[PDB]
From Swiss-Prot:
One of its GO terms (cellular component) is cytoplasm. GO terms for molecular function: metal ion binding. Binds 1 Mg(2+) ion per subunit. CDD domains: REC_CheY_CheY3. Pfam families: Response_reg. It comes from the Bacteria. SUPFAM superfamilies: CheY-like. Keywords: Acetylation, Chemotaxis, Cytoplasm, Flagellar rotation, Magnesium, Metal-binding, Phosphoprotein, Two-component regulatory system. Its cofactor is Mg(2+). It comes from Shigella flexneri. Its main location: cytoplasm. This is Chemotaxis protein CheY. The modification N6-acetyllysine is found at residues 87, 104. Phosphorylated by CheA or acetylated by acetyl-CoA synthetase, depending on which acetate metabolism pathway is available.
Amino acid sequence: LKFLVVDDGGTGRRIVRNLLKELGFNNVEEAEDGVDALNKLQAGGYGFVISDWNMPNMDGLELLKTIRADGAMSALPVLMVTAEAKKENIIAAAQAGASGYVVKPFTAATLEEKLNKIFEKLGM
Ligand SMILES: [Mg+2]
């Protein structure tokens, strides 16, 4: 399953890249903003998207909205990473169609769980 990790911060991508590797997922690509992510997703082949919220050029919510509006990309599982205490962001993400969310900072256990929920939910 090919994952696309989107985050404008290198540390954030490295944290997610290592946790996935630990969980056994070695097919992981990275993008630094919503535009960079869409350029890659349009190329095809992806099976899961993990996206940061605040990013320049195109943020995570706009990215999610774009994915969901696109016929070829609309069915992609999208896990949004929201900041601690930004309750409105979780609500806006759910309304926009996020498959789930995870609040940063998160542990490896929390991340595995959120992933497990989506897999079960979408039946993967
Ligand atoms: Mg960011």
